[PDB]
Ligand binder design. Sequence first.
Ligand SMILES: CCCCc1c(C)nc2nc(SCc3nc4c(c(=O)[nH]c(=O)n4CCCC)n3CC)nn2c1C
Length: 121
Amino acid sequence: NPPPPETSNPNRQTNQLQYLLRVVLKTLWKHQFAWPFQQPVDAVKLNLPDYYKIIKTPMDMGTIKKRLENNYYWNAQECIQDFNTMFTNCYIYNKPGDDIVLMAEALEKLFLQKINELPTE
Ligand SMILES: CCCCc1c(C)nc2nc(SCc3nc4c(c(=O)[nH]c(=O)n4CCCC)n3CC)nn2c1C
């Protein structure tokens, strides 16, 4: 595998960012379908031939959770895009009828529901 993505930013929208960690991520983390997305993809263990040749911006909730905890993000938009990157990576690598895709979509729908609760900008 390549190394996992960075969790620290080498350099106030903090309400939404706090909520992204405490409610959004935690709610997805606890969902039944969370396991494939709780850590960087280990393409050997999970036997995902060519995953890192196809997916150039790998992303996972383990990474996003640490970025939230390290106060890594520029802004809440940047975090929201890591979530979307994770989902869309799954839609790019896998066939649209696969279990893994159905799992991502369900998490994505839940994510959109929780994003609707975000505190104001
Ligand atoms: C035994 C505890 C293992 C935890 C762990 C570790 C250490 N590394 C991992 N790497 C991964 S990759 C999960 C995954 N499986 C996929 C995919 C994927 O995109 N496409 C797939 O077809 N699969 C495999 C589906 C067959 C089970 N992903 C990433 C969304 N999972 N994973 C787990 C659960």
